[PDB]
Amino acid sequence: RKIILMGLRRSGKSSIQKVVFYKSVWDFPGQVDVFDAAFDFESIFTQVGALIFVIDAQDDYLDALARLHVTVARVVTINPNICIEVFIHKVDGLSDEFKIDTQRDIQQRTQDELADIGLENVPISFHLTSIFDHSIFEAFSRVIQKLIPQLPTLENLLNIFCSNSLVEKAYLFDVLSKIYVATDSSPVDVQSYEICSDFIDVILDIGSIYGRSSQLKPGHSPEILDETSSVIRLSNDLVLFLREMNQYLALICIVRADNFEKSGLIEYNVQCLQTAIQSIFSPRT
Amino acid sequence: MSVSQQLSELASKEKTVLYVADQNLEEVLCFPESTDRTTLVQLTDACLHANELAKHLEFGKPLSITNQYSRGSCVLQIAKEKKDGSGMVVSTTIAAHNALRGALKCSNALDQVISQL
Amino acid sequence: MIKPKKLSSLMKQAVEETVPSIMVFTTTGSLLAYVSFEDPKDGLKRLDLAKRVRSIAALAGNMYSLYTATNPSPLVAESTDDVIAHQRDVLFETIIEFERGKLLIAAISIDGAEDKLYSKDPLLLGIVGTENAKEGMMQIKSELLKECITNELSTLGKPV
Amino acid sequence: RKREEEEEWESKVYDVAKNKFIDVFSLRLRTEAPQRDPRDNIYEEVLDQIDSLNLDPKYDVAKPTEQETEFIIRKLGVLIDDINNIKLSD
Amino acid sequence: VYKLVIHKKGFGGSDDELVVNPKVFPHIKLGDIVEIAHPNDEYSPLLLQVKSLKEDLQKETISVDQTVTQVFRLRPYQDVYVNVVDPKDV
Amino acid sequence: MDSQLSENLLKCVNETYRGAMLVRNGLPIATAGDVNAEEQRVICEWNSNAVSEVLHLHDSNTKILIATKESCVLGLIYRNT
Ligand SMILES: Nc1nc2c(ncn2[C@@H]2O[C@H](COP(=O)(O)OP(=O)(O)O)[C@@H](O)[C@H]2O)c(=O)[nH]1
């Protein structure tokens, strides 16, 4: 399945793919929409499960809302299993009072015209994104969580792992895109998410500097390498640690240093969660 | 009364305490009838947590934990589960250096029949 | 400075068929050095052995740390209170018996200083047995490995 | 017809990983607690009234001859010397 | 001393600023005022009213809303002091 | 296990004493011959004041030669018949 980033001109889609994708995501342009027959829209929209519409908060959005409503009607008449999300963008220059009023105005303007159309069965989500923050990564993570059909199993696994091991917060990141596949039931703090995102940057950059011998051997590694595991202790009685789960996944957990004295039991539960994740994501019958 | 029989025979000729306690501290108390102190709940809690911990090893279920302390404070335990599935029963006994290494296996040999019946 | 190759060469000579793995770890389960009976040649055959030894050390350090807060020494040897005042005891051996193996945890009393290279955590010697292993030979191997590691770690505090 | 088998597979591997975890919060000092059941102790006497086994270690003693006693006291001394003659390096 | 967990109002069934587990706090009834303060007090304590009792939390944890902790400089996953104060004093 | 202790334990076992049992005050150190079906725990749990004893089970026919000095016990297994 693919992810289609819709919207209008000067909405911020190219900057989103510059930040997230450039460090299946497709960017349709702000013009030549579904009324035009320049592309086979019904063939693409059948294979696409996530539709994202980017709405500028500062600019006028009523024509954007009408284009969004006719695009929602088009994709519902194509397939009933598509997920629709609304990306309210360019909120870096806005104040704290402006964002809540803009979100309330956009949600009240959209969810009543959804009832006016009559397609009340489909769920439409709303996200506050900005390319200068990490909220675009969290919004794309919540988009990606809808497409994965294995989200409640991983979420229940992370819930019982956080309850058993006294782990405050857990994420299942993808290290290439800094997008977390699953997290626990506790809310995601932005101060936790920034240091969890930069933890991957420190690990990947130091492993790119010093992981030169073997590592990227063209034929095959003669010895199987260890998984990348890291531990950082901070001064505010908190410990961050990573364990490499798969070839593209990792598990960053936030644990108090009072509870990190029994780090062997947390390591054993991380190994059991590694076995669970590698058995879930393996090909089966 | 076999309780008074062992209460004379396992508290005199080797001088060991005997605790057949469990999770909820149903204290089969000190067999020389000394002061109970706080060592019973500490040893029983440590034995239940060690029996919980050692199941996750590859070697299987634990049979006994022979915990030898310094200058003759050697402790042996055997933990066995309840027949109705409501928990586990431990068998704690404390002796000297060569007092455990000797006739204490007789005391646990009677105590495992007790925990069976 | 501690050389783990020196510790591996010191523990390699005390390994028989009935004693597969001998490891040295801390009370928090952090492994320092370990040996094995057969040396693996495959990479994955080394990795799963290292993961098994790390899990064994991680469980054994907490199983030692559960019993280190209990003093059963006043509950034996009824005598005067000066003898009880001489009974400030610490745990130094712990033997656990299974169906398919044995485990021995012994605390290495490191010499030199009381704060030389440990922050109130004694190094623990873990000896893994099998069904045919005998527990009394493991105690002799444990006391020999302790008295050799203590003399090996008596020259700690290496400069610059 | 195939997604339900995947859901059953994920349910059983979730049960496996749930049973394989370690409760760290239960693994602490919950001591210095008041007693809970100090009354249910008469089951100990009514089960261990006799129960057909209160039997001493048997080892039924015959008397040794001086030849076998001399043989085993000669063998035990050199086995004790073999025990204290042990060494780590070969 | 209790661990400070943050939650979101209207998310996960939590519709109050304060979520109090009754099996952790058996002496706290409905409508009580709960004082939440730092150890070695640097800032003002937080007073909240109990409006619901849910048992979803683990032991020695108290759940406060995220914006209320952000206003009162309460760091998540920290030790706090939980006390019950009279309404006539505050 | 050392080689000289192994050959000494092989010198313990013969056509008369069919089983050799070396044990400390509480723990075994060396076995040879047919040491199975109990007949080891009764040697491990054994303790007495004197130094020279001969013991056989009254529900079996296996006679054990037992000596104990310097906290080391040697057991010899042979049938009573
Ligand atoms: N300062 C700021 N500028 C933004 C933000 N988002 C988007 N922009 C600007 O708005 C423009 C939007 O272009 P875009 O719609 O993505 O181009 P298109 O994809 O080809 O239609 C970009 O060139 C950005 O420079 C933001 O959050 N902050």
Short mmCIF file of N, CA and C in Angstrom, two decimals, chain A residues 117-198:
data_model
loop_
_atom_site.label_atom_id
_atom_site.label_comp_id
_atom_site.label_asym_id
_atom_site.label_seq_id
_atom_site.Cartn_x
_atom_site.Cartn_y
_atom_site.Cartn_z
N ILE A 117 -22.66 15.92 3.82
CA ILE A 117 -22.49 15.02 2.68
C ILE A 117 -23.25 13.72 2.92
N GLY A 118 -23.08 13.13 4.10
CA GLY A 118 -23.74 11.89 4.46
C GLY A 118 -22.80 10.72 4.68
N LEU A 119 -21.50 10.88 4.48
CA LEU A 119 -20.53 9.81 4.71
C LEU A 119 -19.99 9.91 6.14
N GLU A 120 -20.86 9.58 7.09
CA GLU A 120 -20.51 9.65 8.50
C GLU A 120 -19.84 8.38 9.01
N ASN A 121 -19.80 7.31 8.20
CA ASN A 121 -19.21 6.06 8.65
C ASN A 121 -17.69 6.10 8.62
N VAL A 122 -17.09 6.82 7.68
CA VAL A 122 -15.64 6.85 7.52
C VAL A 122 -15.00 7.71 8.61
N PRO A 123 -13.86 7.30 9.16
CA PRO A 123 -13.17 8.15 10.15
C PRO A 123 -12.15 9.09 9.51
N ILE A 124 -12.21 10.37 9.85
CA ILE A 124 -11.27 11.37 9.36
C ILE A 124 -10.53 11.96 10.55
N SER A 125 -9.21 11.85 10.54
CA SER A 125 -8.36 12.34 11.62
C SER A 125 -7.79 13.71 11.28
N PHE A 126 -7.33 14.41 12.32
CA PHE A 126 -6.80 15.76 12.19
C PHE A 126 -5.47 15.83 12.92
N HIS A 127 -4.46 16.41 12.26
CA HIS A 127 -3.11 16.47 12.81
C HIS A 127 -2.54 17.88 12.65
N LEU A 128 -1.76 18.29 13.64
CA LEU A 128 -1.09 19.59 13.66
C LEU A 128 0.38 19.36 13.34
N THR A 129 0.79 19.73 12.12
CA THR A 129 2.13 19.44 11.63
C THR A 129 2.91 20.72 11.40
N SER A 130 4.23 20.62 11.54
CA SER A 130 5.16 21.69 11.22
C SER A 130 6.51 21.07 10.90
N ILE A 131 7.13 21.52 9.81
CA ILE A 131 8.39 20.92 9.37
C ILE A 131 9.56 21.30 10.27
N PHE A 132 9.46 22.40 11.01
CA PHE A 132 10.52 22.81 11.91
C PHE A 132 10.44 22.13 13.28
N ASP A 133 9.37 21.39 13.55
CA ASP A 133 9.20 20.63 14.77
C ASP A 133 9.26 19.14 14.46
N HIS A 134 9.04 18.33 15.49
CA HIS A 134 8.93 16.88 15.35
C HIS A 134 7.48 16.41 15.32
N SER A 135 6.53 17.33 15.20
CA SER A 135 5.12 16.95 15.16
C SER A 135 4.73 16.32 13.83
N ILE A 136 5.48 16.62 12.76
CA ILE A 136 5.23 15.98 11.47
C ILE A 136 5.60 14.50 11.52
N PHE A 137 6.67 14.16 12.26
CA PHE A 137 7.07 12.77 12.44
C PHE A 137 6.05 12.00 13.27
N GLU A 138 5.50 12.64 14.31
CA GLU A 138 4.47 12.01 15.13
C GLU A 138 3.17 11.83 14.36
N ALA A 139 2.81 12.82 13.53
CA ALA A 139 1.60 12.73 12.71
C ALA A 139 1.73 11.64 11.64
N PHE A 140 2.91 11.54 11.02
CA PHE A 140 3.14 10.48 10.04
C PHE A 140 3.23 9.11 10.71
N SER A 141 3.69 9.07 11.97
CA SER A 141 3.67 7.83 12.74
C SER A 141 2.25 7.38 13.04
N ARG A 142 1.37 8.32 13.41
CA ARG A 142 -0.04 7.97 13.63
C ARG A 142 -0.76 7.62 12.34
N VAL A 143 -0.29 8.15 11.20
CA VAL A 143 -0.81 7.72 9.90
C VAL A 143 -0.38 6.28 9.61
N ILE A 144 0.91 5.98 9.84
CA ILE A 144 1.49 4.67 9.55
C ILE A 144 0.91 3.58 10.47
N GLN A 145 0.55 3.95 11.70
CA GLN A 145 -0.06 3.01 12.65
C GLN A 145 -1.43 2.51 12.19
N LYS A 146 -2.15 3.31 11.40
CA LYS A 146 -3.43 2.86 10.87
C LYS A 146 -3.26 1.81 9.78
N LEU A 147 -2.19 1.91 8.98
CA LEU A 147 -1.98 0.98 7.88
C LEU A 147 -1.48 -0.38 8.35
N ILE A 148 -0.76 -0.43 9.46
CA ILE A 148 -0.24 -1.69 9.98
C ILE A 148 -1.39 -2.44 10.64
N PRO A 149 -1.71 -3.66 10.20
CA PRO A 149 -2.80 -4.42 10.83
C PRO A 149 -2.39 -5.11 12.12
N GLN A 150 -1.12 -5.01 12.51
CA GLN A 150 -0.55 -5.70 13.66
C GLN A 150 -0.32 -4.74 14.83
N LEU A 151 -0.95 -3.57 14.78
CA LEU A 151 -0.79 -2.56 15.84
C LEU A 151 -1.32 -2.96 17.22
N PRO A 152 -2.52 -3.56 17.41
CA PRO A 152 -2.93 -3.89 18.80
C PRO A 152 -2.12 -4.99 19.46
N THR A 153 -1.57 -5.94 18.69
CA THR A 153 -0.71 -6.97 19.27
C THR A 153 0.60 -6.38 19.77
N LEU A 154 1.23 -5.51 18.97
CA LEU A 154 2.46 -4.85 19.38
C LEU A 154 2.21 -3.86 20.52
N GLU A 155 1.04 -3.21 20.52
CA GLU A 155 0.71 -2.27 21.58
C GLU A 155 0.45 -2.99 22.90
N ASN A 156 -0.21 -4.15 22.85
CA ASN A 156 -0.42 -4.95 24.06
C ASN A 156 0.89 -5.55 24.57
N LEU A 157 1.78 -5.93 23.64
CA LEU A 157 3.11 -6.42 24.02
C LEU A 157 3.93 -5.34 24.70
N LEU A 158 3.89 -4.11 24.16
CA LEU A 158 4.60 -3.00 24.78
C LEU A 158 3.96 -2.58 26.10
N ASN A 159 2.64 -2.74 26.23
CA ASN A 159 1.96 -2.43 27.49
C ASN A 159 2.35 -3.41 28.59
N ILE A 160 2.37 -4.71 28.29
CA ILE A 160 2.73 -5.68 29.32
C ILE A 160 4.24 -5.66 29.58
N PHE A 161 5.04 -5.24 28.59
CA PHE A 161 6.47 -5.11 28.82
C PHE A 161 6.78 -3.88 29.68
N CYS A 162 6.05 -2.78 29.48
CA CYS A 162 6.23 -1.61 30.33
C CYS A 162 5.69 -1.83 31.73
N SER A 163 4.62 -2.61 31.87
CA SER A 163 4.09 -2.88 33.20
C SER A 163 4.96 -3.87 33.96
N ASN A 164 5.52 -4.86 33.27
CA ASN A 164 6.33 -5.87 33.95
C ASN A 164 7.72 -5.36 34.32
N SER A 165 8.36 -4.59 33.44
CA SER A 165 9.76 -4.22 33.61
C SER A 165 9.97 -2.86 34.24
N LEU A 166 8.88 -2.20 34.69
CA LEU A 166 8.88 -0.83 35.25
C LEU A 166 9.48 0.18 34.29
N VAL A 167 9.18 0.02 33.01
CA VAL A 167 9.64 0.93 31.96
C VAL A 167 8.60 2.03 31.79
N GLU A 168 9.04 3.29 31.86
CA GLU A 168 8.12 4.42 31.83
C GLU A 168 7.50 4.61 30.45
N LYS A 169 8.31 4.48 29.39
CA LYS A 169 7.86 4.78 28.04
C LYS A 169 8.65 3.91 27.07
N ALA A 170 7.98 3.39 26.05
CA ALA A 170 8.65 2.58 25.04
C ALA A 170 8.15 2.95 23.65
N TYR A 171 9.07 2.96 22.69
CA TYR A 171 8.74 3.18 21.29
C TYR A 171 9.43 2.12 20.44
N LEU A 172 8.84 1.82 19.29
CA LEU A 172 9.44 0.90 18.32
C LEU A 172 9.75 1.70 17.06
N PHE A 173 10.91 2.35 17.05
CA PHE A 173 11.29 3.20 15.93
C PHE A 173 11.75 2.41 14.72
N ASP A 174 11.63 3.04 13.56
CA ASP A 174 12.39 2.69 12.37
C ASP A 174 13.57 3.66 12.31
N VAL A 175 14.79 3.13 12.22
CA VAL A 175 15.97 3.96 12.41
C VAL A 175 16.26 4.82 11.18
N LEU A 176 15.78 4.41 10.00
CA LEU A 176 16.06 5.17 8.79
C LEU A 176 15.20 6.42 8.67
N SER A 177 13.96 6.38 9.17
CA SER A 177 13.01 7.46 8.98
C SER A 177 12.62 8.17 10.27
N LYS A 178 13.07 7.66 11.43
CA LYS A 178 12.74 8.16 12.78
C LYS A 178 11.23 8.20 13.02
N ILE A 179 10.53 7.18 12.54
CA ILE A 179 9.08 7.05 12.67
C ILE A 179 8.82 5.80 13.50
N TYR A 180 8.12 5.95 14.62
CA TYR A 180 7.92 4.84 15.54
C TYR A 180 6.71 4.01 15.12
N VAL A 181 6.93 2.70 14.99
CA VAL A 181 5.89 1.79 14.55
C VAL A 181 4.83 1.61 15.64
N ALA A 182 5.27 1.42 16.88
CA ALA A 182 4.33 1.21 17.98
C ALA A 182 4.87 1.87 19.24
N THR A 183 3.95 2.19 20.14
CA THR A 183 4.28 2.73 21.45
C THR A 183 3.29 2.17 22.46
N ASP A 184 3.51 2.50 23.73
CA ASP A 184 2.63 2.01 24.79
C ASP A 184 1.43 2.95 24.96
N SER A 185 0.59 2.65 25.95
CA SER A 185 -0.65 3.37 26.15
C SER A 185 -0.47 4.75 26.78
N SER A 186 0.68 5.01 27.40
CA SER A 186 0.94 6.31 28.00
C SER A 186 1.19 7.35 26.91
N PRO A 187 0.85 8.62 27.17
CA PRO A 187 1.01 9.66 26.13
C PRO A 187 2.46 9.98 25.82
N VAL A 188 2.68 10.46 24.60
CA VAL A 188 4.01 10.75 24.08
C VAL A 188 4.35 12.19 24.41
N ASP A 189 5.32 12.38 25.30
CA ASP A 189 5.83 13.72 25.57
C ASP A 189 6.75 14.18 24.45
N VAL A 190 6.69 15.48 24.13
CA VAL A 190 7.54 16.03 23.09
C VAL A 190 9.00 16.10 23.56
N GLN A 191 9.22 16.35 24.86
CA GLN A 191 10.57 16.37 25.41
C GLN A 191 11.19 14.98 25.44
N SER A 192 10.36 13.95 25.61
CA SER A 192 10.86 12.58 25.49
C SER A 192 11.12 12.22 24.04
N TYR A 193 10.24 12.66 23.13
CA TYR A 193 10.34 12.26 21.73
C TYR A 193 11.53 12.92 21.02
N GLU A 194 11.90 14.14 21.43
CA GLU A 194 13.05 14.81 20.83
C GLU A 194 14.35 14.10 21.17
N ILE A 195 14.51 13.70 22.44
CA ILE A 195 15.73 13.00 22.83
C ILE A 195 15.72 11.56 22.32
N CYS A 196 14.53 10.96 22.13
CA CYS A 196 14.46 9.64 21.53
C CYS A 196 14.76 9.68 20.04
N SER A 197 14.44 10.79 19.37
CA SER A 197 14.78 10.94 17.96
C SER A 197 16.27 11.23 17.77
N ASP A 198 16.86 12.03 18.66
CA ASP A 198 18.28 12.35 18.52
C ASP A 198 19.19 11.24 19.05
#
